Amino acid sequence: KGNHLVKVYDYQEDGSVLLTCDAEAKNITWFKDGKMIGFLTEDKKKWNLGSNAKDPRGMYQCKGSQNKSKPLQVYYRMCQNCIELNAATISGFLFAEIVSIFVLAVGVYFIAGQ
Amino acid sequence: VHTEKVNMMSLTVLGLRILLLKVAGFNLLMTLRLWSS
Amino acid sequence: TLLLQLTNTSAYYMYLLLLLKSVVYFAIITCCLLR
């Protein structure tokens, strides 16, 4: 091996992503997109990111006791927004828009000084 | 595969539908209040 | 289920759009009312 110690744990049925840095030092902090944000206290080395719904990104460094640890990455794009484009959804969109426009136009026509 | 946020979306779409119903009723009611029909 | 999320997001966008339409209709009718 060399210079690579960042392992993401997975194969859990709940919505959580988390990191493991296999370094032997005291208070190894975490870098993020090139400016430091996170900080680690002992009894844990499990700098969780939250859930795989906000689509975490960015390159993360834990400062190993030699110089640094180059990133791995994070990229999670599950579905979040999933508008279908079959022959049903787009047709429904057009139909609903036309109907609403027609009804409002009829109302406005009736509205005009009568 | 989790079913945690789909329920939230189905709950908020109900609120959106009830708001649409209320606002449409309001608008129709005032438009008819004006005149004509 | 994926299909539920699909349909739900599409319909949420649709209903938000419809409410947005009804809002401008209300604006027009209230402009007529006040005038």
Binding site: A88, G92, A96, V99, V103 | L21, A24, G25, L28, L32, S37 | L3, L4, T7, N8, A11
Partner: peptide, 28 residues
């Protein structure tokens, strides 16, 4: 089944309802 059919039928029912509302309150 499928929620798509439910929503389409809901929209049809809604437009029918608003039209009948307009007609009813016009006549009365």
């Amino acid at each position: 089944l499928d929620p798509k059919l439910c929503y389409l039928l809901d929209g049809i029912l809604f437009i029918y309802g608003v039209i009948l509302t307009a007609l009813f309150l016009r006549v009365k």
